[PDB]
Design a protein around this ligand. Structure first.
Ligand SMILES: *[C@@H]1O[C@H](CO)[C@@H](O[C@@H]2O[C@H](CO)[C@@H](O)[C@H](O)[C@H]2NC(C)=O)[C@H](O)[C@H]1NC(C)=O
Ligand SMILES: *[C@@H]1O[C@H](CO)[C@@H](O[C@@H]2O[C@H](CO)[C@@H](O)[C@H](O)[C@H]2NC(C)=O)[C@H](O)[C@H]1NC(C)=O
Ligand SMILES: *[C@@H]1O[C@H](CO)[C@@H](O[C@@H]2O[C@H](CO)[C@@H](O)[C@H](O)[C@H]2NC(C)=O)[C@H](O)[C@H]1NC(C)=O
Ligand SMILES: *[C@@H]1O[C@H](CO)[C@@H](O)[C@H](O)[C@H]1NC(C)=O
Lengths: 99, 50, 26
C-alpha cells in the first residue's frame, strides 16, 4: 500500500524517519567500542594515569627498559603492574612508588 | 594457531637453519602475529599450495 | 574446477623443544 505523505497530513499521518541501532553481544569480542578521551603525559609529582585500561600512580620516566615491539605491559618478580609504553608515541615508560 | 575466547591468535617466528632439518636441537620463541577476532568454529584445516 | 592430484601419504619424525610462544603481551 502506498503512502500519501502530503504536507497537510495530520501529526498521526506525518512521516517519521526511524533509525534503529542494533547491538550484538555474541561470543566473539572485537574492537567495536566507543571513543575514549586522550590527555597529555604527566610526571614529576606523579598524577593518576589510566593507560589503555590499566590504572596506576607511579612516577612516569623515560628509562631504557626497552620492551619488545609487541608487548604492551610490564611486570616485575612480584607481578607489580609496571608502566606501559605510550599508546600514541610508542615511548617506553616505567613507574616506581611515589615516596 | 589457536581458537580461544573467539580470538584466532597466530604465533610465528622465522628461524634460519644451516643443514638438513629434523626439528634440530635448538630453542626459539614464537611471537604473536595477529589477533583476528572472528570466533569461527575451526575443526579442520588444509595446507594451501601453489 | 580443481584437479585432485595433491593427495599423498603421511610420515612421522622426532621433534624437539619447539612450539614455545609468548602466552601474554607483557
Ligand atoms: C638485550 O641484550 C643485548 C645483548 O647483550 C643488550 O645489548 C647490550 O647492551 C649493553 C648495555 O647498554 C651494551 O653495553 C652492549 O654493547 C650491548 N650489546 C650489543 C651487541 O648491542 C641489550 O641491552 C639487552 N636489552 C636490554 C633492554 O637490556
Ligand atoms: C597520533 O596523532 C599525533 C598527532 O598527529 C601523532 O604525533 C605526530 O607524530 C609524527 C610522527 O609520526 C610527528 O612527526 C608529529 O610531529 C607528531 N605530532 C604531534 C602533534 O605530536 C602521533 O604519531 C599519532 N599516533 C599514532 C599511533 O597514530
Ligand atoms: C560452534 O560449535 C558449537 C558446538 O560444536 C556450537 O554450540 C555451542 O557450543 C558451546 C560449547 O559447546 C556453547 O558454549 C554454546 O552456547 C553453543 N552454542 C549454541 C548456539 O548452542 C556453536 O553454536 C557453534 N558456533 C559458535 C559461533 O560457537
Ligand atoms: C609416531 O606415531 C607413529 C604412528 O602412531 C609411530 O609409527 C611412530 O613411531 C611414532 N613416533 C615416535 C617417535 O615414536
Amino acid at each position: 500500500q502506498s503512502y500519501g505523505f502530503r504536507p497537510t497530513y495530520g501529526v498521526g499521518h506525518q512521516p517519521y524517519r526511524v533509525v534503529v541501532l542494533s547491538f550484538e553481544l555474541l561470543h566473539a569480542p572485537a574492537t567495536v567500542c566507543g571513543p575514549k578521551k586522550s590527555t597529555n603525559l604527566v610526571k614529576n609529582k606523579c598524577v593518576n594515569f589510566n593507560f589503555n585500561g590499566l590504572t596506576g600512580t607511579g612516577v612516569l620516566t623515560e628509562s631504557n627498559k626497552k620492551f619488545l615491539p609487541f608487548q604492551q605491559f610490564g611486570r616485575d618478580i612480584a607481578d607489580t603492574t609496571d608502566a606501559v609504553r605510550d599508546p600514541q608515541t610508542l615511548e617506553i615508560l616505567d613507574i616506581t612508588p611515589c615516596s | 594457531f589457536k581458537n580461544i575466547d573467539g580470538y584466532f591468535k597466530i604465533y610465528s617466528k622465522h628461524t634460519p637453519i644451516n643443514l638438513e632439518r629434523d626439528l634440530p636441537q635448538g630453542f626459539s620463541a614464537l611471537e604473536p602475529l595477529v589477533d583476528l577476532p572472528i570466533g569461527i568454529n575451526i575443526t579442520r584445516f588444509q595446507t594451501l599450495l601453489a | 574446477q580443481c584437479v585432485n592430484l595433491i593427495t599423498r601419504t603421511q610420515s612421522y619424525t622426532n621433534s624437539f623443544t619447539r612450539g614455545v610462544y609468548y602466552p601474554d603481551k607483557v
